[PDB]
Design a protein around this nucleic acid. Sequence first.
DNA 1: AGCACA
Length: 84
Amino acid sequence: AASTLFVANLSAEVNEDTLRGVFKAFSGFTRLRLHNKNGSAVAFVEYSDLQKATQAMISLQGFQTANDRGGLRIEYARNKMADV
DNA sequence: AGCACA
């Protein structure tokens, strides 16, 4: 089953391709969605299974495309990315 | 801390 990650601390100017380049570098990358609301943006990144998602989350934690200090803040998403 | 798409 595909496991989705939640990514915070993103600048509003970051590209979808740019962000893809960050996460596609890790094994099991399936798809990414970049969402914006009022200010800064967040992202949902899907991997082929949990182990690859965990592996990527640990590795990219605090990755320096950000607003605040600390770099990227990544969590497990509360829900899986919808099918299709 | 802040979690959408269908």
